Amino acid sequence: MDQKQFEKIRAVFDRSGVALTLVDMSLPEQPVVLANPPFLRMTGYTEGQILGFNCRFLQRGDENAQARADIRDALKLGRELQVVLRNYRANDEPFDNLLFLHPVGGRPDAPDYFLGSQFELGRSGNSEEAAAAGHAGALTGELARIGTVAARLEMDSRRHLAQAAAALVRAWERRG
Amino acid sequence: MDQKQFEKIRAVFDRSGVALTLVDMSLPEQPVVLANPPFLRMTGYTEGQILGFNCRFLQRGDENAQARADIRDALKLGRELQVVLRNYRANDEPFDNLLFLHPVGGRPDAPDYFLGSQFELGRSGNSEEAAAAGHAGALTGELARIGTVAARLEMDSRRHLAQAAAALVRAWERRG
Numbered sequence: 001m002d003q004k005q006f007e008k009i010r011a012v013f014d015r016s017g018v019a020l021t022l023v024d025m026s027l028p029e030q031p032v033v034l035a036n037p038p039f040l041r042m043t044g045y046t047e048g049q050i051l052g053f054n055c056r057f058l059q060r061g062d063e064n065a066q067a068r069a070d071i072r073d074a075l076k077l078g079r080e081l082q083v084v085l086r087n088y089r090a091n092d093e094p095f096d097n098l099l100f101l102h103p104v105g106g107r108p109d110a111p112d113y114f115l116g117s118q119f120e121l122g123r124s125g126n127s128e129e130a131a132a133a134g135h136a137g138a139l140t141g142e143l144a145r146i147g148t149v150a151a152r153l154e155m156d157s158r159r160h161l162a163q164a165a166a167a168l169v170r171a172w173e174r175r176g
Numbered sequence: 177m178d179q180k181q182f183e184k185i186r187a188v189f190d191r192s193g194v195a196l197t198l199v200d201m202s203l204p205e206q207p208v209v210l211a212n213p214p215f216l217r218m219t220g221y222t223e224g225q226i227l228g229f230n231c232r233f234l235q236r237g238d239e240n241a242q243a244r245a246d247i248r249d250a251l252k253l254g255r256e257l258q259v260v261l262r263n264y265r266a267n268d269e270p271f272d273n274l275l276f277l278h279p280v281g282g283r284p285d286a287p288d289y290f291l292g293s294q295f296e297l298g299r300s301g302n303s304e305e306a307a308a309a310g311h312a313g314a315l316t317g318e319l320a321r322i323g324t325v326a327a328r329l330e331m332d333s334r335r336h337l338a339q340a341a342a343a344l345v346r347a348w349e350r351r352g
């Protein structure tokens with residue numbers, strides 16, 4: 001709602017150890033309005049190549065059909081979601097992206113923004129499950145700092161998000 | 177730095193979503209000098225009952241003989257350590273504590289302080305491994321905030337600490 005919360009999000013984003021993006025849900029094009037350094041490092045793009053545009057261009061011509069259908073549903077309902085996407089860096093190298101989506105601000109059924117956090121798969125040797133759960137932990141800490149996760153709920157939320165990320169890595173590893 | 181640096185650590189501690197303690201290694205008894213709200217909640221003690229005392233008050237009898245020997249070695253050598261301890265709340269309720277130890281400040285041969293972060297085991301159902309890795313991820317975020325882990329190293333440090341936590345949980349589950 002408030003500009004004060006927005007400034008807090010910008011500050012948290014700037015210093016975060018995890019990739020973070022913020023998208024404005026009040027516009028149909030759903031443009032990125034914030035994209036932090038770990039995101040740009042992972043994708044290889046500069047800030048100016050991201051802000052004002054939808055994130056989907058990271059997919060190039062890969063349909064990612066079921067994941068996108070799950071995403072559109074979560075965005076419409078204002079619910080959180082974790083899903084694996086096939087993406088490309090600016091230099092056209094492909095990577096697998098475990099994306100965490102969280103509604104931020106506004107009204108519970110209609111958030112003002114969505115936050116996205118990207119965990120790059122395939123870069124943690126044989127400890128992918130632990131690394132993803134680790135990401136979820138660090139992310140839950142940032143959600144608490146921006147006020148999206150209440151303090152009293154952080155420990156339980158961390159457990160749940162970490163377990164959700166590890167489960168998704170297992171399913172993803174079980175196939176292909 | 178010095179008192180001023182301490183007060184930033186204090187600020188991180190106060191707001192953290194994970195249990196955190198700080199011990200001054202320059203005082204012979206190695207007393208706890210910072211203990212944050214989630215640590216107090218987990219242990220059932222007030223701040224006043226804790227500060228100025230060695231953290232071994234959480235133990236009883238001569239329990240944890242080998243883990244304590246491992247702890248004394250890590251402390252002496254200035255090494256990180258993860259270890260499981262039988263601890264008790266102020267009401268004597270037992271809990272198992274996955275303790276993360278991290279040197280803070282000073283030089284490799286002589287840290288000024290040690291940080292301890294406590295993850296309570298046995299509260300996560302089937303999610304112990306993921307929940308522990310999640311804690312490691314949150315913790316690594318705080319270690320970067322206080323300057324103990326460099327920003328460009330946070331992602332790698334998170335991966336390895338989460339891997340270590342999960343491995344220790346598996347070991348712990350596969351003993352008994």
Ligand SMILES: Cc1cc2nc3c(=O)[nH]c(=O)nc-3n(C[C@H](O)[C@H](O)[C@H](O)COP(=O)(O)O)c2cc1C
Nearest residue numbers: 021023054055056058059068071072085114115116
């Ligand atoms: C906050 C946020 C972050 C997103 N991050 C990514 C991303 O990193 N990679 C990606 O392929 N899609 C990402 N998306 C998804 C696309 O923006 C888009 O929502 C998705 O492709 C489904 O919509 P569509 O079927 O119209 O393309 C993100 C969406 C949101 C709201």
Ligand SMILES: Cc1cc2nc3c(=O)[nH]c(=O)nc-3n(C[C@H](O)[C@H](O)[C@H](O)COP(=O)(O)O)c2cc1C
Nearest residue numbers: 197199230231232234235244247261290291292294
């Ligand atoms: C920063 C820090 C945090 C600690 N946290 C705990 C703890 O939560 N529970 C516990 O049983 N011991 C904890 N300890 C360990 C005890 O303080 C003590 O080092 C250990 O029992 C080994 O020494 P001892 O054999 O003389 O008791 C911590 C130590 C340090 C330095």
